[PDB]
């Protein structure tokens, strides 16, 4: 029992139509996509950064490791 004791609500009217009188995926270009982009923009500069900043650290550590495996001719110039 949870429907009926939820909240004291007053003066809000809502309107909705049967699923059969409307389109499932409507206004894909006029509304859908524009917002997909909108949402994508609002976040990139929050998420992307640390992830990119990770990639770098990954690349560096990786390449440096391989580098330290290579031989330095400056150990054999003498003999």
């Amino acid at each position: 029992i949870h429907f009926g004791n939820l909240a004291r609500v007053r003066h809000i009217i809502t309107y909705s139509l049967s699923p059969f009188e409307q389109r499932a995926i409507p206004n894909i270009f006029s509304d859908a996509l524009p917002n997909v982009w909108r949402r994508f923009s609002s976040q990139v500069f929050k998420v992307a950064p640390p992830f990119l900043g990770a990639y770098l650290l990954y690349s560096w550590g990786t390449q440096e490791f391989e580098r330290l495996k290579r031989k330095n001719p400056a150990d054999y110039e003498n003999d």
Partner: protein, 442 residues
């Protein structure tokens, strides 16, 4: 025998005046009577800018005419003991009088004087404007009508029928002597009117007195033609006016109706006769024959509920309405939809047999007096184009059987997206989706 008492009911005389008006009446041995004009006008015929006029007009129809102003008009009627009443719906308006048959003619005169020469005194309007404005506030507190309005508002959303008979607040605040005048001059016309009457009146003495005050003739062919209205589109949808501050909740649910002319309406009625109605003051209580009523009682599901088949020229609304407490809305609705499903899938001969008798008794009671008869004549013509006698109705009702009730209800209810309106503390009633699925599988 019942059968005979029906055949012996005098006929309803109908003759058409060269101008298009139709005069009809049923003569009885009664000293008193009811005569009136039933019109094919109303809010539906209105538009966004004049919505409410037909009502504003109703408010002035009695405040006197040109030939005899307010004081006089009122005084002249009261003094003869006649009762003057009238109304206006979405597709029908009417003004009628109750007086002794002896004054049948002086009455007819008065009527004609009202529909044809309403004063529309510039000074009266500004007063009735304040009056109507308060009537709206009083009606705004009658959940039952606030609900049916909303029901229409959405069932026919975006169309002519989605309009309230009283009209907008603005519309009433600004309508003009002109707009009102126009409405009358545009809608109140002979071909769309019916002078009906019942009591101790002679059709002749009536029709004669008719030609005398309803003489206005038409020249062009347009004036003889009744304009067909652009039809209204139904829409499975919901509108929820919530206010937990109200003590009870009101719910109305419906599918689109067939419209006056369709025969199925008889079966549809026979159907609602089965589900019927309830109200906490019915003494039958738990023994009532109506399954929904019983559950309502056994489980305290609601304060009242009613089934209805509101018809219109080209459409209609077939559904139900109930008032319940915030916490019993769901079970109530649940059970209700159950019965509709029961209609479609498992009606019994026993059920219909009864429903029929209840219906027969219903039609007969609809003609209990002169005003009610006159109201039936004024309507049958205006809607069916003629008169359907109890003798006929009965035959159409007697022919209904289970197998038939099932097919029809299925045809109009099963798996249809319904229109729903809820007002009050409706939190427990929820989701259109859910309600939509209550529309199939008993």
């Amino acid at each position: 025998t019942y059968a005979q008492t029906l055949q012996n009911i005098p006929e309803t005389n109908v003759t058409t005046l060269d101008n298009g008006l139709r005069v009809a009446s049923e003569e009885s041995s009664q000293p008193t009577c009811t005569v009136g004009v039933w019109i094919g006008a109303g809010s539906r015929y209105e538009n966004e800018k004049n919505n409410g006029a037909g009502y504003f007009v109703e408010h002035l129809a009695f405040k006197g005419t040109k030939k005899r102003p307010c004081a006089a008009f009122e005084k002249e009627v009261e003094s003869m003991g006649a009762h003057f009443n009238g109304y206006t719906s979405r597709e029908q308006t009417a003004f009628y009088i109750k007086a002794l048959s002896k004054d049948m003619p002086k009455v007819v005169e008065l009527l004609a004087d009202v529909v044809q020469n309403c004063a529309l005194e510039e000074s009266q309007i500004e007063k009735e404007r304040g009056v109507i404005l308060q009537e709206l506030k009083e009606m705004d507190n009658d959940m039952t009508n606030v609900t049916f309005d909303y029901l229409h508002a959405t069932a026919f959303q975006g169309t002519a029928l989605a309009r309230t008979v009283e009209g907008t607040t603005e519309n009433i605040k600004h309508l003009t002597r002109a707009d009102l005048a126009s409405y009358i001059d545009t809608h109140f016309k002979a071909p769309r009117m019916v002078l009906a009457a019942a009591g101790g009146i002679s059709h002749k003495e009536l029709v004669d007195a008719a030609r005398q005050h309803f003489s206005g003739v038409s020249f062009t062919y347009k004036e003889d033609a009744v304009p067909i209205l652009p039809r209204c589109r139904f829409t499975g949808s919901e509108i929820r006016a919530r206010d937990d501050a109200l003590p009870v909740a009101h719910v109305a649910l419906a599918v689109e109706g067939p419209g006056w002319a369709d025969p199925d309406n008889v079966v549809l009625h026979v159907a609602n006769a089965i589900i019927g109605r309830y109200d906490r003051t019915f003494g039958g209580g738990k023994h009532l024959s109506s399954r929904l009523a019983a559950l309502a009682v056994e489980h305290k599901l609601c304060h009242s509920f009613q089934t209805f088949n509101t018809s219109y020229s080209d459409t209609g609304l077939f559904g139900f309405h109930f008032v319940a407490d915030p916490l019993s809305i769901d079970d109530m609705m649940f059970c209700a939809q159950g019965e509709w499903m029961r209609l479609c899938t498992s009606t019994t001969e026993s059920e219909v047999k009864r429903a029929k008798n209840h219906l027969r008794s219903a039609m007969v009671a609809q003609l209990d007096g002169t005003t009610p008869v006159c109201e039936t004549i004024g309507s049958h013509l205006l809607n069916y184009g003629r008169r359907i006698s109890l003798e006929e109705w009965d035959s159409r009702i007697s022919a209904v059987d289970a197998r038939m009730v099932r097919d029809v209800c299925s045809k109009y209810i099963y798996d249809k997206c319904p229109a729903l309106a809820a007002v009050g503390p409706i939190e427990q009633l929820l989701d259109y989706n859910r309600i939509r699925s209550g529309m199939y599988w008993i």
